[PDB]
Symmetry: D2
Subunit: 203 residues, 4 copies
């Protein structure tokens, strides 16, 4: 039932979990500590199929540009909603970058066009324009929500790619919440993953 807030209005919420570290042990042996030893053994040599028997269901609220990257992970199940909020980058988001415009003003200019686009959308809607058409004016930082069911193996591949300094900061934050939850429900698998398979650097 975990829920972690991300960005200004987003979140990653655990909906359900099937199995735990032992589910992988049971699959590896096809049965029902030497177990903690098996998990590391499987992880080191790359015998990842057993980890497919651990599944998670997440409910995610994220901006569309983050969701688009996320949806690139094909080995998972998705259900997106089909209620108007936008991700406004905080000023600290620009730290490290020397901008002509003070960080606060960048955050302002972003709020402004967002507000203008949204008002235009509302206007078109109020005039009878089909929502599917009017919505194309909305910006990429609009929040959407979706359910994500993914097994532990696919999830680790997701973390290898998004829990990395080379990934956009925003997606990293989401990947951090995903890892946090994965760690809570599968300590052994996660630790093992971190010790032998994790390719990123932020975890």
């Amino acid at each position: 039932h975990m829920k972690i807030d991300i960005l200004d209005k987003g979140f990653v919420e655990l909906v359900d979990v099937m199995g735990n570290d032992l589910s992988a042990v049971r699959a590896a042996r096809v049965s029902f500590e030497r177990d903690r030893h098996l998990i590391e053994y499987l992880m080191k040599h790359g015998h990842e199929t057993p980890f497919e028997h651990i599944v998670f269901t997440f409910h995610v609220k994220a901006p569309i540009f983050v969701a688009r990257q996320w949806f690139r992970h094909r080995i998972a199940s998705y259900n997106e909603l089909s209620s108007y909020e936008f991700y406004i980058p905080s000023p600290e988001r620009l730290e490290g970058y020397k901008t002509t415009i003070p960080p606060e003003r960048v955050t302002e200019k972003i709020s402004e066009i967002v507000d203008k686009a949204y008002r235009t959308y509302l206007e078109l809607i109020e005039s009878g324009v089909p929502r599917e058409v009017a919505r194309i004016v909305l910006p990429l930082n609009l929040y959407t929500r979706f359910f994500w069911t993914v097994n532990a193996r696919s999830l680790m591949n997701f973390l290898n790619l998004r829990a990395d300094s080379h990934a956009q900061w925003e997606i990293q934050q989401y990947a951090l919440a995903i890892a946090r939850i994965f760690k809570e429900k599968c300590p052994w698998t996660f630790e093992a993953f971190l010790k032998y398979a994790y390719k990123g650097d932020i975890l």
Copy 2:
């Protein structure tokens, strides 16, 4: 839940994530008779994705010729006993040969299958007793040798499996496994199952064979 299939096989439910409501939750993307109304609506309109949020893990013991057919379903996860490092055989019953006129009595056919299986197995043990590695010695064992595997699959894929295996076109032996699979599916997801039969099931036996 363990259901015996054939002479020594079985389908045993290991774990399950969610139920009919999981698909309802997924469909609405949030947290009585209207939920069941939703399941039906999704099924009759081809909105299958919500059902991917229901997942099962089965433990199956079946003859290799049946497993081979089963493993053809790629949208699932499998873990089977290693033929290399990890001995019962399926002997059809005389009744299995009912309907086909044979030159010899059904029990004769049954006896003969039992005969070769016995010879193959005896030869196998002989090879092993001789120092022959199992990965090599096992190649003489027949296709009716029983094997075991864990199968994790979501409800949408499980329904595709039923469309194909719980049908008269599939070999009788796997139909039997498909019936047990359907039996378990129905008990864990009654609304989805009824909706499935009513609007999307393409097979024939599940609409004739109770549960």
Copy 3:
């Protein structure tokens, strides 16, 4: 073989592996024209579609992001979208034509709806350049751009998955924009695999517009 879609989009055939006979060869597992078409119709009629997985296409698509998001929901395929790390990035947007709004009674004339969409696109785009020039990283600045921004991708999919794509997108219930791309996809598919395409429409196509 290229087809223009919307105002600045397109679907272009990049490569294709096999033809109708590739599904025949796979079905028979090996290696008379009417005997071959009969097998193809036979496979399609009984839902034996795996043989059609041995026909593959690679398309180059230029579409608005909102169309792309729906398209990318088809997981049994391969995609590579433009990033800017290997190729230059261009900025164009889908501006609906007044006709797109027919059948709908609007308080604002169609031409005025088109005008308003162009307006936001212009302002969103300029705010974007404003941010870039100010030293704001593109990854951050681009978040103000609208969903009608055109993007490009390569799409490799086999004929079976392709037919699933047409069943869902070449249909009146799918958004009009994606329908236009689906029609174009169907067309190239027909040109390269007429027997398979014919059979698809006769026994398996679930949609309506084709």
Copy 4:
């Protein structure tokens, strides 16, 4: 392009879509410089950006013993079409003495060969008998040994193919499938030389392909 494997098997190239440049065009998303293209292939492989290689596809026709096919069919990201056993041509894999020539046995390597050959013969005969008798082939075939040869068409993209080689072109895999993987590698090397060399240099996890040639 056909290569014999084991005593009666083979791997045959049926078709192929694209080449090394298919990955380059996909990574650049452009459908319009050997030095630079080769550099990009290596860059992609070195940094794990593997999706571009999914736009290179192969179709093979394979003949292998069922015990080998069962291992092969475990690779799910691919397309398979196998001969229907439920609905001619029965051959079996008989290990040569050199196969066991490395393990201490209590009988001559040649005896194992004869032993295996015997049962295969006995099982095959019983099967033919049952068939003649009127027993459906889907039922009579269950007495056939796992070394029976089957055939299938295999369509797989370059990315998935490399995962297959990682796992099967390795000393940890059974010797028999190792032989097939070597043949697969040979064909792969011939059609996509750059991707293959890049594969071996930055991503290949097995042993044999860096030891054996082509």
